[PDB]
């Protein structure tokens, strides 16, 4: 991601890059009711506006896994 | 992703790139009712506006897995 | 991510980069009711506006895992 | 991430970079009711506006894990 | 992250970098009610506007872990 | 993170860097009620505007761990 | 609009009424361009989510009238 | 709008009424461009989430009127 | 708007009323550009989340009127 | 707006009333640009979260009027 | 607005009333640019979170009027 | 606005009233730029969190008026 310019008037040079970006989010909630009952497991809920960038690794978002033996 | 320009008037050079981007989201909820009952498992719910970029890895979003033996 | 310019008028050179960024978020909640009952497990909820960048590692967001033996 | 310029008029050279950044967040809550009952487990809730950058390590945000034997 | 300039008019050279930064956050709460009952476990809640940068280590934010044997 | 300049008019050279910074936070609370009852465990709550940078070590923010045997 | 109940089990009596109410509206706009040129007249535009109740009077919403002589 | 109850079990009596109410509105705008040129007239624009109740009077919302002679 | 109750178990009596109320509004704007040029007239713009109740009078919201002679 | 109760168990009597009330509003703005040029007129803009109750009078919100002769 | 109660158990009697009230408002602004040029007129802008109650009088909020002769 | 109670257990009698009240406001601003140029007129800007109650009089908030002859 480089940007070079030479001159020998308006000159514009740009190089933009986005990875894993969340923006411009508007949320309205009213009288939302939730009830979770877990017995020896895994429950994931209520995930909003989450951004993640992972390099040379495993990336999990809102991941629920049962018991491992 | 490069951008070069030479001059010897308006000159514009650009190079944009997006990967895993969420934007411009509007959500309205009213009187939403939920009920989760889990016994030794995995439950995933309520995932909204999630962006992820993964390199050299396994990326999981809202992934639920049972017990592993 | 470099930016070079030479001159021998307005000259602009830029190089922007974003990874794992959340912005421009507006949230309104009213009378939200929640109830969590966990017995020997894992529960994750209420995750909002979370950004993470991980290099040479495993990145987990809102990840719930059962008991490991 | 470098920035070089030579001159021999307005000249601008820039090189910006963001990783794991949260900004521009407005949150309003009214009469929110919560109730958590945990017996030998792990519960995570109420995570908002969290940014993290990890190098050569495992980064977890709002991660709940059951008992490990 | 370097910045060099040579001259032989306005000349600007900059090199900015951000990692794990939270800013521009406004939060309003009214009559929020919470109740936590824990018996031999781990509960995490009420995390807001948290930034962390970790090098050569494992970084955990709002992480709850059960008993380890 | 260096910054060099040579001259032989306004010349500006800068090199800024931020890691783990929280700023521009405004919080208003009214009649918030909390109640925590813990019996041999760990409870973490009410964490706001926390920044940490760790080098060659494990950094935990708002981390609750059960009893270790 | 009355509600009466007598008792000598769950008993519910209600009487709800709505007049001129707008709710549950989500709007997303992107790159909208407008241009208005008025010379001695009246122009009305961009009216959204407007509610009005008028008693013993004339109610006008987004009403444009030319010059009156 | 009255509510009466007599007792000699759960008993509920209610009487709700709404007039001119706007709620549950989420709006997202991006790069909206506007341009207004008025010469001796009236221009109205950008009206959103407006509620009004008028008794014994004339109620106007986003009303533009030309010159009156 | 009255509420009476007599007793000789849970008894609830209520009487609620709303007039001209705006609530639960979330707005996100990004790079909005505006330009107004007025010469001897009236321009109204950028009206959001406005509530008004008027008794025995004329109520105007975002009303633009030309010159009156 | 009265509330009476007699007793000879939980008894609740209430009488609530709202007129011209704005609440639960979250607004986020980024890089908004405005430009107003007025020559002998009236310009109104940038009105947000305004509530007014008027009795025996004329109530105007964000009202622009030209010159009166 | 009265409240009476007689007794001869929990008894609750209340009578609440609101007129012209603004609350629960969170606003975030970033890099907003404005420019006003007025020549013998009236300009009003930047009005936020304003409440007014007027009895036996004319109440104006963010009202701009041209020259009166 | 009266409150009476007689007794011959918890008894509660209340009578609350609000007029022109602003509360629970959180505002964050960053790099806001303004520029006002006025020549024989009136400019009003930057009004926030203003409450006023007027009896037997005309109440104006953020009102700009041109020259009066
Ligand atoms: C998340 C994100 C991604 C990409 C972004 O990039 C948008 C952008 O660069 N917009 C632009 C350019 C100009 C302009 C004005 C005058 C000129 F002479 C030349 C250019 N004005 O706005 C931004 C964000 C915030
Ligand atoms: C996420 C994302 C992706 C791509 C984006 O790119 C849009 C863009 O660049 N739009 C533009 C260009 C001009 C312009 C017009 C005439 C000129 F002379 C100079 C500039 N105005 O707006 C943005 C985002 C935010
Ligand atoms: C998160 C993020 C990503 C990208 C961003 O980049 C946007 C940007 O650079 N916008 C711009 C350029 C000009 C301009 C116009 C004419 C000139 F002559 C000189 C400069 N005005 O605004 C910002 C953010 C905050
Ligand atoms: C988090 C974050 C990311 C990126 C950011 O970058 C935005 C930026 O640099 N905006 C800009 C440029 C100019 C300008 C004016 C006159 C000139 F001649 C040349 C440039 N004005 O605003 C900021 C933040 C806060
Ligand atoms: C967190 C963060 C990240 C990046 C930031 O960078 C923004 C910035 O540099 N903005 C700018 C440039 C000028 C300017 C215009 C014309 C000139 F001739 C000289 C300077 N004015 O504002 C800031 C923060 C606070
Ligand atoms: C704008 C508007 C109009 C009408 C509305 O009225 C809906 C409503 O009253 N829903 C309801 C009743 C019950 C219930 C639960 C248990 C019981 F024993 C008896 C009743 N639960 O939700 C609301 C709005 C917000
Ligand atoms: C997600 C995404 C993908 C692609 C996008 O690209 C759209 C775009 O670039 N639109 C444009 C160009 C111009 C223009 C004006 C004057 C000129 F002289 C030359 C060009 N105006 O708007 C944006 C997004 C946000
Ligand atoms: C604007 C507006 C209009 C009408 C509204 O009325 C809704 C309402 O009253 N809902 C309700 C009733 C019960 C309940 C259930 C069982 C019981 F035993 C006792 C009470 N739970 O929620 C609200 C608004 C905010
Ligand atoms: C703007 C506005 C309008 C109307 C509103 O009215 C809603 C309301 O009253 N909800 C309710 C009732 C009960 C309940 C619980 C236990 C019981 F035994 C009996 C009743 N819980 O919530 C509120 C607002 C904020
Ligand atoms: C603006 C506004 C309007 C109306 C409002 O009224 C809401 C309300 O009264 N809610 C409620 C009742 C109970 C309750 C439940 C069981 C009991 F036994 C006793 C009381 N809990 O919450 C509030 C506002 C802030
Ligand atoms: C602006 C505004 C308007 C109205 C408001 O009124 C709300 C209210 O009164 N809420 C309530 C009642 C009880 C309760 C608890 C135990 C009991 F036995 C009986 C009642 N707890 O909270 C407040 C504001 C701040
Ligand atoms: C601005 C404003 C308006 C109205 C307000 O009124 C709220 C209120 O009165 N709340 C309440 C009642 C009880 C309670 C519960 C059980 C008991 F036995 C005795 C008292 N706890 O909180 C406040 C403000 C600050």
From Swiss-Prot, chains A, B, C, D, E, F, G, H, I, J, K, L:
Signal sequence bounds: none
Entry-annotated residues carrying Phosphoserine: 60
Post-translational modification (record): Phosphorylated, predominantly on serine residues. Phosphorylation by CK1 appears to occur on residues distinct from the residue phosphorylated by other kinases.
Tissue localization of expression: Highly expressed in presynaptic terminals in the central nervous system. Expressed principally in brain.
Superkingdom classification of source: Eukaryota
Chain positions recorded as Cu cation binding sites: 23
Sequence repeats: 15-29, 30-40
Region: 4 X 11 AA tandem repeats of [EGS]-K-T-K-[EQ]-[GQ]-V-X(4), residue numbers: 6-40
Cell compartments where the protein resides: Cytoplasm; Membrane; Nucleus; Synapse
Pathological association: Genetic alterations of SNCA resulting in aberrant polymerization into fibrils, are associated with several neurodegenerative diseases (synucleinopathies). SNCA fibrillar aggregates represent the major non A-beta component of Alzheimer disease amyloid plaque, and a major component of Lewy body inclusions. They are also found within Lewy body (LB)-like intraneuronal inclusions, glial inclusions and axonal spheroids in neurodegeneration with brain iron accumulation type 1.
Family assignment from sequence similarity: Belongs to the synuclein family.
Domain notes: The 'non A-beta component of Alzheimer disease amyloid plaque' domain (NAC domain) is involved in fibrils formation. The middle hydrophobic region forms the core of the filaments. The C-terminus may regulate aggregation and determine the diameter of the filaments.
Task performed by this protein: Neuronal protein that plays several roles in synaptic activity such as regulation of synaptic vesicle trafficking and subsequent neurotransmitter release. Participates as a monomer in synaptic vesicle exocytosis by enhancing vesicle priming, fusion and dilation of exocytotic fusion pores. Mechanistically, acts by increasing local Ca(2+) release from microdomains which is essential for the enhancement of ATP-induced exocytosis.
Subunit annotation: Soluble monomer. Homotetramer. A dynamic intracellular population of tetramers and monomers coexists normally and the tetramer plays an essential role in maintaining homeostasis. Interacts with UCHL1. Interacts with phospholipase D and histones. Interacts (via N-terminus) with synphilin-1/SNCAIP; this interaction promotes formation of SNCA inclusions in the cytoplasm. Interacts with CALM1. Interacts with STXBP1; this interaction controls SNCA self-replicating aggregation. Interacts with SNARE components VAMP2 and SNAP25; these interactions allows SNARE complex assembly and integrity.
Protein name: Alpha-synuclein
Native species: Homo sapiens
Gene: SNCA
Whole-protein residues included: 15 to 96 of 140
């Amino acid at each position: 991601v480089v940007a070079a310019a030479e001159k020998t008037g308006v000159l514009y040079v740009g190089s933009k890059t986005k990875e894993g970006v969340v923006h411009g989010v508007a949320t309205v909630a009213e009288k939302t009711k939730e009830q979770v009952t877990n017995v020896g497991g895994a429950v994931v809920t209520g995930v909003t506006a989450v951004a993640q960038k992972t390099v040379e690794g495993a990336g999990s978002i809102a991941a629920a896994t049962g018991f491992v033996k």
